[PDB]
Amino acid sequence: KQDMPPVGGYGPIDYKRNLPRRGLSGYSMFAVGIGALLFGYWSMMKWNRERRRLQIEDFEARIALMP
Amino acid sequence: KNFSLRIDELEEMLTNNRIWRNRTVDIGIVTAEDALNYGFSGVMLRGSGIQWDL
């Protein structure tokens, strides 16, 4: 008279299938990308242009000597 | 009661994965009634067409 099945206490667990979490898609991407990339080239032309100014100063000390 | 999460991992490893989908699509398509003339049992049957199992 000592046998298994309980009178109660059950679930069940699902048979389902779901993890579609979105996700920042669909014109949200391709907009943060271009907005990041244009910040890069804007951070250029303030350094590459400025290094071009110090470049001429480096040639300047050459030319003021050599006679 | 806690196995459906473990099978919810292989769905994210394999199914919507691209490289494994590229390794396995449209490969070994034997589907005709030569796929029943050969006397196949289940899957490589019902996974291709004919709904039947004992």
UniProtKB/Swiss-Prot annotation, chain A:
It comes from the Eukaryota. It is found in: Mitochondrion inner membrane; Nucleus. Signal peptide: none annotated. The chain crosses the membrane at residues 24-45. Belongs to the complex I NDUFA13 subunit family. Complex I is composed of 45 different subunits. Interacts with CARD15, but not with CARD4. Interacts with STAT3, but not with STAT1, STAT2 and STAT5A. Interacts with OLFM4. Accessory subunit of the mitochondrial membrane respiratory chain NADH dehydrogenase (Complex I), that is believed not to be involved in catalysis. Complex I functions in the transfer of electrons from NADH to the respiratory chain. The immediate electron acceptor for the enzyme is believed to be ubiquinone. Involved in the interferon/all-trans-retinoic acid (IFN/RA) induced cell death. This apoptotic activity is inhibited by interaction with viral IRF1. Prevents the transactivation of STAT3 target genes. This is NADH dehydrogenase [ubiquinone] 1 alpha subcomplex subunit 13. It comes from Bos taurus. The chain holds residues 7 to 73 of 144 of the full protein.
Curated annotation (Swiss-Prot), chain B:
It is found in: Mitochondrion inner membrane. This is NADH dehydrogenase [ubiquinone] iron-sulfur protein 2, mitochondrial. Core subunit of respiratory chain NADH dehydrogenase (Complex I) which is composed of 45 different subunits. Component of the iron-sulfur (IP) fragment of the enzyme. Interacts with NDUFAF3. Interacts with NDUFAF7. Interacts with CERS2. It comes from the Eukaryota. Core subunit of the mitochondrial membrane respiratory chain NADH dehydrogenase (Complex I) which catalyzes electron transfer from NADH through the respiratory chain, using ubiquinone as an electron acceptor. Essential for the catalytic activity and assembly of complex I. Redox-sensitive, critical component of the oxygen-sensing pathway in the pulmonary vasculature which plays a key role in acute pulmonary oxygen-sensing and hypoxic pulmonary vasoconstriction. Plays an important role in carotid body sensing of hypoxia. The gene is NDUFS2. It comes from Bos taurus. The chain holds residues 249 to 302 of 463 of the full protein. Belongs to the complex I 49 kDa subunit family.
